[PDB]
Scaffold this active site. Structure first.
Site, mmCIF file in Angstrom:
data_model
loop_
_atom_site.group_PDB
_atom_site.id
_atom_site.type_symbol
_atom_site.label_atom_id
_atom_site.label_comp_id
_atom_site.label_asym_id
_atom_site.label_seq_id
_atom_site.Cartn_x
_atom_site.Cartn_y
_atom_site.Cartn_z
ATOM 1 N N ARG A 275 -35.898 22.498 111.662
ATOM 2 C CA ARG A 275 -34.499 22.217 111.999
ATOM 3 C C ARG A 275 -33.836 21.271 110.987
ATOM 4 O O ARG A 275 -32.656 20.895 111.142
ATOM 5 C CB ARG A 275 -34.362 21.690 113.431
ATOM 6 C CG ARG A 275 -34.813 22.675 114.536
ATOM 7 C CD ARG A 275 -34.595 22.042 115.920
ATOM 8 N NE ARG A 275 -35.420 22.651 116.964
ATOM 9 C CZ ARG A 275 -34.946 23.251 118.053
ATOM 10 N NH1 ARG A 275 -33.632 23.326 118.257
ATOM 11 N NH2 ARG A 275 -35.788 23.769 118.946
HETATM 12 N N1 LIG Z 1 -26.825 30.717 112.321
HETATM 13 C C1 LIG Z 1 -28.044 30.377 111.828
HETATM 14 N N2 LIG Z 1 -28.415 30.694 110.573
HETATM 15 C C2 LIG Z 1 -29.622 30.356 110.077
HETATM 16 N N3 LIG Z 1 -30.564 29.697 110.771
HETATM 17 C C3 LIG Z 1 -30.317 29.314 112.048
HETATM 18 C C4 LIG Z 1 -29.017 29.633 112.657
HETATM 19 N N4 LIG Z 1 -29.041 29.165 113.924
HETATM 20 C C5 LIG Z 1 -30.244 28.571 114.102
HETATM 21 N N5 LIG Z 1 -31.000 28.660 112.986
HETATM 22 C C6 LIG Z 1 -32.364 28.122 112.845
HETATM 23 O O1 LIG Z 1 -32.871 27.864 114.160
HETATM 24 C C7 LIG Z 1 -33.108 26.462 114.322
HETATM 25 C C8 LIG Z 1 -32.736 26.101 115.748
HETATM 26 O O2 LIG Z 1 -31.318 26.180 115.920
HETATM 27 P P1 LIG Z 1 -30.630 25.170 116.957
HETATM 28 O O3 LIG Z 1 -29.142 25.403 116.911
HETATM 29 O O4 LIG Z 1 -31.141 23.774 116.745
HETATM 30 O O5 LIG Z 1 -31.255 25.771 118.339
HETATM 31 P P2 LIG Z 1 -30.945 25.253 119.848
HETATM 32 O O6 LIG Z 1 -29.846 24.226 119.757
HETATM 33 O O7 LIG Z 1 -30.565 26.490 120.613
HETATM 34 O O8 LIG Z 1 -32.267 24.686 120.272
HETATM 35 C C9 LIG Z 1 -32.225 25.792 113.271
HETATM 36 O O9 LIG Z 1 -32.654 24.494 112.859
HETATM 37 C C10 LIG Z 1 -32.267 26.782 112.133
HETATM 38 O O10 LIG Z 1 -33.445 26.549 111.366
HETATM 39 MG MG LIG Z 2 -29.619 22.171 120.305
#
Ligand SMILES: Nc1ncnc2c1ncn2[C@@H]1O[C@H](COP(=O)(O)OP(=O)(O)O)[C@@H](O)[C@H]1O
Ligand SMILES: [Mg+2]
Ligand SMILES: Nc1ncnc2c1ncn2[C@@H]1O[C@H](COP(=O)(O)OP(=O)(O)NP(=O)(O)O)[C@@H](O)[C@H]1O
Ligand SMILES: Nc1ncnc2c1ncn2[C@@H]1O[C@H](COP(=O)(O)OP(=O)(O)NP(=O)(O)O)[C@@H](O)[C@H]1O
Ligand SMILES: Oc1ccc(/C=C/c2cc(O)cc(O)c2)cc1
Ligand SMILES: [Mg+2]
Ligand SMILES: [Mg+2]
Lengths: 310, 495, 310
Positions: B358
């Site tokens: 992340r």
């Molecule tokens: N639109 C995107 N493009 C590329 N990678 C993404 C995208 N959305 C998420 N990721 C990958 O997934 C990981 C988790 O996304 P995140 O938004 O933190 O998930 P959530 O908030 O649903 O737990 C990110 O750190 C990234 O590595």
């Molecule tokens: Mg989140």
């Protein structure tokens, strides 16, 4: 001093002491019984009352019945005269061959060897069994577990290993029957007499036997593993020697703990088990070990409830 | 008339009402604080967790057999804390900070509360510095930065601990070095494990000369539930000492599945009603407050950091289950390992699609970003197309190329144990693949090629490797030099 | 009126009052603490005792410690002074920039707008995100939810939305960090300083920040969503304005409630949740709304435990 029974439910007996409350793990002797009835202190409930686990059946017990504190935990014969003998959870002979006249007794409770006592030597123990030797080899003085659901081959495997590893072994062995078939104990006993690994006339017996099988109430099944393991510890330390420890079946210890845990008043954990499942298992398993002082190669059959490894 | 004995008043002391399963219920102690350490007449310590009108529910940091009804219990006045500092380096200690390696008392000069809140918003800055594992697959696809939390997760025996071990061992090249800021002090917290396994582990770290910069906090299978429960928080504080003093630490929690089991035990015995899967309702918070404490500090707070690699064991490969997702929902990514991959020969057994960082390229050197920047999405599409193409019939030029690249990259991210790789060596190797110079090499030869290529650049082009390491990037000059090495060498290799 | 602590177990504190019992939802102030410790009244237990949830850690609390009734629910600063500031659950600044000098405060607990206050206008809010715009477009003044299991992209999506829609927004925005990563809060803050939607030097800030993250005990996490919501309500009503409300993550309000629920004495409902899950969500969610007075476009990240949408 002298206590009185205030409550009985299966293996769980509460005992009130006017003076001198017995510590946790102490062995109490119930008075007015034909055969020895041991109660092990599990908890101090308050109001001078202790909660105990029975080592044999509690039928015939009356509220008010007298109990004496032995002043120690369960203590069993250890050393050379356990060899060729069968003993139960509280170290009584169950082979009709009279007293076990040892000079030493040891408590079935003991703290696990400390971190400094650990050995780091890794050496293969060749079994002659292709699948084990090739893919998941055993180690000398290592911990070996045999997982199986009902009837898939745990005992046959443990017996083949006794046949293959134990036959050519210049040390002592301990077999502990824990919550298994009594007639399997009878088979093993008479096979070892036939082979001469147990000798009824010589002092040349190389195996100690300890049994608390599926005819036993839960307190006995929850403790016989400690009893057999205690016998093995003496040989490991007080001879420094290479010991084999076979257990069939270690799951029955956990299952037995499950049966008394409700009676003990604990809130159940997942799948209805004792919340102490892992710590009960930890303080027992961590004694089953090689140390700098001596080696234990342990082989444990591990029953898998409903074939569910999870 | 002689003076009365006031040593035993019910404000500063108490008496045990009942004791069982590591729970003492104590009359008196009217002045105790919540979460205060108390002392039993036997020398055992315990923590005040339940304050009730008529009793204190005390949780025992050891064996309860010496505790009896009526025994005296004393306030310490102190919220549970641990010794802390550099004196702990190279030592093996229990959950309370006591030496268990037989090497004498820790001469530590400072102490720290185990339950301190994670730093808030202002004391921090974005994670930007690489925490190199030396594992190609991690450092390229799911890169870890200083201050990050990254989960290691998978069934029994999939390689979880080995990821952590290789990462600790890798730090020696920084720790033997002269750039103080690049150094990383390590902390291994063992929870629920068997003692002999922890001993083999420190033996491995010793033979690797990695103990000297590592603290091992051990609360093993025969230690009481409260000890196993506390161990991660104790190790965390030990790690926070570096974090707050301009240094960088790495902490491994091995594992948090076993810690959550000990917390469950302790909570049930306190009579706190069970929730989902019999765990307390706040099993997320147990781990959330712990891992929030891994953080990157801003320059005003010293610029130090604590990085966390917690470990979770799944059952039957199910990363989607309740407890696993709880911990995934805390960390800045996860490395998911599977038996299937492991036995097919994908080792480390990382599932690319299911793993993430992340922090991403913010945690990578520019050079690694240059070679690895699009690879993770690319490998996800590759695996999908390889499954869809399964029935081998007429594939267009684009997908055939995608396939050839993918199958070869997979070989390049395979890695053995105990030799974690310097970043520039990782970059040289990944470079040969992502730039397509290996696209016509038989995939089964890739591993033989890499090792020969690596030994060649190490021996012959130490200057190119030096420049990439020092510059932190592949310059136009370095690029030109690398192309000439891999094309001509490969041709030799294929003769 | 002065009360005294009679029990502490985790986040849940029981307080006895000799005179006037604080009504449910009242903020109580714990005496003898270094930083302000607020207890919120949850239940009247009988016998002049109230059950409360703490808004911060309960470590260091002592049976007998004094507690003052403040006379109202948690009241926080609302108004233009909140813009470019970070606040916590109880409206204290946590950006180290001194007092929030508002002319007015508001209780975090309020009635939801009535049915007659509802608006039915709905026009597209274009995001520049293909899949959203094509298949399931957002509406201005609408209620938007982003559902996902752990690590699927909820927060990245909300940040892209903040990037695409909020940067060039004419009115105010509120971002409520609820039970999420502190790191993410520091990221967002410095990003918004960089883009200029937060300005630390003048009065041009367009976003108010309210955070109570997963380093916080359940009380803070169960109330910090209301703090954020109360800020947006002021902007909506006492300026009638176009407000953007981003919440990451609204699940953590429900989860926080589940953590204290057993200590509040509830039998659990299914899947370990409080029986009050739906009404708790209802009284909170019905305040997150456009009315006739003003519009709120609300975007809420919604965590999906064990990937199970059911
Ligand atoms: N639109 C995107 N493009 C590329 N990678 C993404 C995208 N959305 C998420 N990721 C990958 O997934 C990981 C988790 O996304 P995140 O938004 O933190 O998930 P959530 O908030 O649903 O737990 C990110 O750190 C990234 O590595
Ligand atoms: Mg989140
Ligand atoms: N190695 C083997 N070769 C052939 N048959 C076998 C073998 N092992 C087990 N069996 C068959 O399976 C039966 C059960 O074997 P056993 O070793 O008693 O299994 P177990 O798992 O110990 N059963 P239980 O203790 O009741 O759960 C034997 O009587 C054989 O019929
Ligand atoms: N990159 C690798 N290549 C080959 N073998 C490996 C690699 N990594 C780990 N292993 C081996 O795989 C086995 C399991 O690794 P380990 O790190 O102990 O996994 P684990 O999930 O921590 N096991 P446990 O904690 O015992 O349930 C060990 O024999 C390792 O030596
Ligand atoms: O056939 C069955 C198989 C498994 C079970 C599970 C029971 C169970 C009960 C709990 O309180 C917690 C838990 O984690 C599991 C029930 C029936
Ligand atoms: Mg059998
Ligand atoms: Mg491991």
């Amino acid at each position: 001093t002298t206590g009185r029974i205030v409550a009985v439910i299966g293996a769980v007996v509460d005992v009130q002491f006017d003076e001198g409350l017995p510590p946790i793990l102490n062995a109490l002797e119930v008075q007015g019984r034909e055969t020895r009835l041991v109660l092990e202190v599990a908890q101090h409930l308050g109001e001078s009352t202790v909660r105990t686990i029975a080592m044999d059946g509690t039928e015939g017990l009356v509220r008010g019945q007298k109990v004496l504190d032995s002043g120690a935990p369960i203590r069993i014969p250890v050393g050379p005269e356990t060899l060729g003998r069968i003993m139960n959870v509280i170290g009584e002979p169950i082979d009709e061959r009279g007293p076990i006249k040892t000079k030493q007794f040891a408590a079935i409770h003991a703290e696990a060897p400390e971190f400094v006592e650990m050995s780091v030597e890794q050496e293969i123990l060749v079994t002659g069994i292709k699948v084990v030797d090739l893919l998941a080899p055993y180690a000398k003085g290592g911990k070996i577990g045999l997982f199986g659901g009902a009837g898939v081959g745990k005992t046959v495997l443990i017996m083949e290993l006794i046949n293959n590893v134990a036959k050519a072994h210049g040390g002592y062995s301990v077999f502990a029957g824990v919550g298994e078939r009594t007639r399997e104990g009878n088979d093993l006993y008479h096979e070892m007499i036939e082979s001469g690994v147990i000798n009824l006339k010589d002092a040349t017996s190389k195996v100690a036997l300890v049994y608390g099988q599926m005819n036993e109430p839960p307190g006995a099944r929850a403790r016989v593993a400690l009893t057999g393991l205690t016998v093995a510890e003496y040989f490991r330390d007080q001879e420094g020697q290479d010991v084999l420890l076979f257990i069939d079946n270690i799951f029955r210890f956990t299952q037995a703990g499950s049966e008394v845990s409700a009676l003990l008043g604990r809130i159940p954990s997942a799948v209805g088990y004792q919340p102490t499942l892992a710590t009960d298992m930890g303080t027992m398993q961590e004694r089953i070990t090689t140390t700098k002082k001596g080696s234990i190669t342990s082989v444990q059959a591990i029953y898998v409830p409903a074939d569910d490894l999870t | 008339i002689l003076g009365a004995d006031t040593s035993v008043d019910l404000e500063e002391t108490g008496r045990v009402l009942s004791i069982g399963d590591g729970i003492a219920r104590v009359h008196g102690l009217r002045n105790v604080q919540a979460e205060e350490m108390v002392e039993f007449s036997s020398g055992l310590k315990g923590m005040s967790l339940n304050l009730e009108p008529d009793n204190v529910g005390v949780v025992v940091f050891g064996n309860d057999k010496l505790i009896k009804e009526g025994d005296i219990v004393k306030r310490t006045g102190a919220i549970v804390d641990v010794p802390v500092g550099e004196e702990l380096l190279g030592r093996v200690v229990d959950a309370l900070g006591n030496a268990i390696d037989g090497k004498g008392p820790i001469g530590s000069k400072a102490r720290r509360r185990v339950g301190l809140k994670a730093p808030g918003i202002i004391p921090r800055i974005s994670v930007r510095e690489p925490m190199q594992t030396g594992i190609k697959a991690v450092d390229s696809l799911v890169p870890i930065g200083r201050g990050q939390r990254e989960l290691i997760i998978g069934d029994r025996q999939t390689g979880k601990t080995s990821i952590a071990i290789d990462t600790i061992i890798n730090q020696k090249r920084f720790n033997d070095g002269t750039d103080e800021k690049k150094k990383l002090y390590c902390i291994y917290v063992a929870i629920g494990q068997k003692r002999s396994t922890v001993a083999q582990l420190v033996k491995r770290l010793t033979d690797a000369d990695a103990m000297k910069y590592t603290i091992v906090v051990s609360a093993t299978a025969s230690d009481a539930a409260p000890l196993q429960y506390l161990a991660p928080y104790s190790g965390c504080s030990m790690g926070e000492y570096f974090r707050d003093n301009g240094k960088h630490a790495l902490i491994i929690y091995d594992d948090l599945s076993k810690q959550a089991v000990a917390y469950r035990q302790m909570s049930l015995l306190l009579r706190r009603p069970p929730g989902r899967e019999a765990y307390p309702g706040d099993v997320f918070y147990l781990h959330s407050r712990l891992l929030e404490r891994a953080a990157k500090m801003n320059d005003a707070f010293g610029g130090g950091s604590l990085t966390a690699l917690p470990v979770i064991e799944t059952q039957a490969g199910d990363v989607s289950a309740y407890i696993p997702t709880n911990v995934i929902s805390i960390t800045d990514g996860q490395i998911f390992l599977e038996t299937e991959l492991f036995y097919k020969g994908i080792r480390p057994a990382i599932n690319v699609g299911l793993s993430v960082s992340r922090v991403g390229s913010a945690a990578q050197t520019r050079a690694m970003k240059q070679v690895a920047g699009t690879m993770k999405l690319e490998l996800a599409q590759y695996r999908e197309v390889a499954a869809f193409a399964q029935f081998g019939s007429d594939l267009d030029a684009a997908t055939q190329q995608l396939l050839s690249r993918g199958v070869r990259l997979t070989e390049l991210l395979k890695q053995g144990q105990y030799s974690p790789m310097a970043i520039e060596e990782q970059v040289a190797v990944i470079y040969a693949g992502v730039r397509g110079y290996l696209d016509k090499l038989e995939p089964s030869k890739i591993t033989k090629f890499e090792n020969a290529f690596l030994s060649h650049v190490i021996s012959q082009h130490q200057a190119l490797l030096s420049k990439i390491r020092t510059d932190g990037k592949i310059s136009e000059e370095s690029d030109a030099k690398l192309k000439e090495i891999v094309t001509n060498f490969l041709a030799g290799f294929e003769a």
